Amino acid sequence: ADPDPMKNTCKLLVVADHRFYRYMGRGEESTTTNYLIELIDRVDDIYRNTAWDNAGFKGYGIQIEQIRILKSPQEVKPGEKHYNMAKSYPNEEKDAWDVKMLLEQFSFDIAEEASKVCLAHLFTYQDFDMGTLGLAYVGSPRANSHGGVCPKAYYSPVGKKNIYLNSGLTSTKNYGKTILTKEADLVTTHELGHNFGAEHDPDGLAECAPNEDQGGKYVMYPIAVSGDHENNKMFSQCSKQSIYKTIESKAQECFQERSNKVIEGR
Numbered sequence: 001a002d003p004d005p006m007k008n009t010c011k012l013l014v015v016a017d018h019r020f021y022r023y024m025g026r027g028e029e030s031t032t033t034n035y036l037i038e039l040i041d042r043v044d045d046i047y048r049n050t051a052w053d054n055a056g057f058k059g060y061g062i063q064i065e066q067i068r069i070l071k072s073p074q075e076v077k078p079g080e081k082h083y084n085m086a087k088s089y090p091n092e093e094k095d096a097w098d099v100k101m102l103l104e105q106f107s108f109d110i111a112e113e114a115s116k117v118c119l120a121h122l123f124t125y126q127d128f129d130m131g132t133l134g135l136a137y138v139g140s141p142r143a144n145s146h147g148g149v150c151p152k153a154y155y156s157p158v159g160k161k162n163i164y165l166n167s168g169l170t171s172t173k174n175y176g177k178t179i180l181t182k183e184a185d186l187v188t189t190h191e192l193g194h195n196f197g198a199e200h201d202p203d204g205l206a207e208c209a210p211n212e213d214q215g216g217k218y219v220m221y222p223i224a225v226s227g228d229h230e231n232n233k234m235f236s237q238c239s240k241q242s243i244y245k246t247i248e249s250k251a252q253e254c255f256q257e258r259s260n261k262v263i264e265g266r
């Protein structure tokens, strides 16, 4: 099983909510798309150059298919919620949503567009409790996988539609501060890594959680350790095992060819 050039790319829906647009894009479309285009490039760089078998099974990446920028809050009726509404949920005195509820709701609301891509990712700007930066559904090689890349849908009778949990989100706000772009690069790489089927690197396995004087942790380590060490922008063998099986299984199904189109999504 070696890479198919016509199926080596996971096409991505990128969504920026009004909070990201206002604070990170400074309320400019141009600034917003520039920031996201460059972040996905840097994330893709990590992925393409990763050899999941440590041999030559590499060149798998991600490419933006759509950048959906929501320029104001979603109008809502009493009772209703929407991942892009003005207030945070379920507690509107907090800066941020409950982050699990946010991913669930983003997944529900963005379902029509998520059905058309390998992954959908929300970019937002809020301070989640406990210093959380991202969250994503974990992929799997299982034929009946219901999360991450190329998942099976859950049907929503109330929504009269299929819901796909091929989703995740990143916040570039933490403890009231905008994070460094190189920190943001890592979080999104981490959240996408779950989608591709990796769990956290266990602090147990030293070869998957090397000490600082050993080159530092790999990207799927569940704490944002300060300073930049070599391993930070690499996938551990623990991650590589999981992600390799997942790709090998799912790429034929919903990966595409690398392209540089004039217009995406037509």
Ligand SMILES: CC#CCOc1ccc(S(=O)(=O)N2CC[C@H](S)C2)cc1
Pocket (backbone or CB within 6 Å): 131, 132, 133, 134, 135, 136, 183, 186, 187, 188, 190, 191, 219, 220, 221, 222, 223, 224, 225
């Ligand atoms: C800098 C860097 C890096 C590696 O990426 C991370 C992403 C999310 C987190 S987190 O704090 O949000 N944690 C709770 C949920 C998520 S998926 C893991 C911690 C680290």
Ligand SMILES: [Zn+2]
Pocket (backbone or CB within 6 Å): 190, 194, 200, 222
């Ligand atoms: Zn994680």
